[PDB]
Amino acid sequence: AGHMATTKRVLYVGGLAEEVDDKVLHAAFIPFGDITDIQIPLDYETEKHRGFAFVEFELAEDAAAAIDNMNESELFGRTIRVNLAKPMRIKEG
Amino acid sequence: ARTKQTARKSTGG
Amino acid sequence: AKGNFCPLCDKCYDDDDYESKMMQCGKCDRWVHSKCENLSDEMYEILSNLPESVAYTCVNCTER
Ligand SMILES: [Zn+2]
Ligand SMILES: [Zn+2]
């Protein structure tokens, strides 16, 4: 058992397009509240992003609004995931 | 990633 | 030893310290702190849970 919902100052993004850069996550996530940091770790199989990224808000309540409005929605021509950076896990484990 | 919080062959346990 | 030095701040690291929040670069094998980056201690815990096929990179290791 657990809560029906949760919030945090940081949240996860995945399934984004192959041409997405850290500037896209800012312009895509800014209307829900002010962003303060963004991160994209490097994948060594092809020297590009792993197909996911990270973003951080000025408040935890603004992250819940970014999830409530872009979760499982199209960004660059295909669906992307949006949720807190705690409950999820990569498709590689 | 490679860190000081973890460096095992896998994150499982 | 005293030859250790961070690529982004004047601080350094011990040869046996594992309680400090730090990551290793995937392209030049150099260590880094969380405070000399735009990162935060909450985002550091998820980076630790990512698979080893993905890793952090210096302010230049991401472009060159
Ligand atoms: Zn440092
Ligand atoms: Zn590096």
3-class DSSP state of C58: coil
Q: Do the Cβ atoms of A42 and C58 come closer than 8 Å?
A: no
Q: How far is the CA of C22 from the centre of ligand 1 (A)?
A: 9
C-beta separation of A55 from A64 below 8 A: no
Which residues share a beta bridge with A84?
A11
Q: Judged by CB atoms within 8 Å, which residues 39-58 of A form the interface with C?
A: 39, 41-45, 50, 54, 56
Report how far apart, in Å, the C-alpha atoms of A85 and of each of A6, A8, A63, C44, C63 are.
11, 8, 11, 10, 26
Task: Considering only CA atoms, give the Rg of chain B.
Answer: 7
Task: Please provide the size of chain B in residues.
Answer: 13
**C60 C-alpha to center of ligand 2: Å?**
7
The CATH class of A10-84 is alpha beta
CA distances from A22 to A12, A39, C13, C20, C55 (A): 13, 7, 29, 27, 16
Distances (CA, A) of A83 to A25, A27, A68, C36, C46: 14, 18, 9, 26, 13
What is the rounded (10 degree) CA torsion for C50, C26, A24, A46? -90
